[PDB]
From a paper:
Compared to the WT, the nat_mutants D63G and P80R appeared to form more distinct complex bands with SL4ext in the EMSAs. Interestingly, in contrast to the other nat_mutants, NMR-derived CSD plots for both mutants revealed more significant changes in comparison to the WT, suggesting a more far-reaching modulation of their fold or plasticity toward complex formation with RNA. We further investigated the RNA-binding of D63G and P80R, located in the N-loop and counter finger, respectively, by NMR spectroscopy. We were able to solve the 1.7 Å and 1.9 Å crystal structures for D63G and P80R, respectively. Surprisingly, both mutant structures superimposed with WT similarly well as the other nat_mutants, with RMSD values of 0.668 Å (D63G) and 0.898 Å (P80R), respectively. Although the overall differences between the mutant and WT structures were insignificant, a closer look at the site of mutation at position 63 revealed the loss of salt-bridge/H-bond interactions between residues G63 and R89 in our D63G structure. These subtle changes in intramolecular interactions possibly alter the flexibility of R89 sidechain and may lead to modulated RNA-binding properties of D63G. In line with the retained backbone at this position in the crystal structures, {1H}15N heteronuclear steady-state NOE (hetNOE) values of backbone amides in the D63G mutant do not differ significantly from WT around the site of mutation. From those, only P80R and D63G exhibit slightly increased affinity for RNA, which likely correlates with an increased positive surface charge that possibly supports RNA engagement. On the protein level, mutations D63G and P80R also impact the gene product of the overlapping shifted open reading frame ORF9b47,48, where they result in T60A and Q77E, respectively.
Residue numbers in the entry: 50 to 171
The structure:
């Protein structure tokens, strides 16, 4: 499980951030730790007609070296994965932060610093 709540893509543009932006605020992490990826999670449902459809994609953040793409190095090219890093982060895996157990931690509400650029529809 991600440490954070998702970003929902209500529009047609997939997620991306300008370099330096996009890492969720987490006061239980340090400057070196501010680096990772969002991963798209799509869900299907039965619509009100007889028919399966996609819900709006969700994008969940994971620290570098953790989560479903724990094996990927920063910048690796993969569909549904985008990368973010705050100025000064170390490009090292964040096993010390890891992923969340919902049994014993709520998700942290995803917040970005004042004035982050967001694609249309986030």
């Amino acid at each position: 499980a991600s440490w954070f709540t998702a970003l929902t893509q209500h529009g047609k543009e997939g997620l991306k951030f300008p370099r330096g932006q996009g890492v969720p605020i987490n006061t239980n992490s340090s400057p070196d730790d501010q680096i990772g990826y969002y991963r798209r999670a799509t869900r299907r449902i039965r619509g009100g007609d007889g028919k399966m459809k996609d819900l709006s994609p969700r994008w969940y953040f994971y620290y570098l070296g953790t989560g479903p793409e724990a094996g990927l190095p920063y910048g690796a090219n993969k569909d549904g994965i985008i990368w973010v890093a705050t100025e000064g982060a170390l490009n090292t895996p964040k096993d010390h932060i890891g992923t969340r157990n919902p049994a014993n931690n709520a998700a942290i509400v995803l917040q970005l610093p004042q004035g982050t650029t967001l694609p249309k529809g986030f």
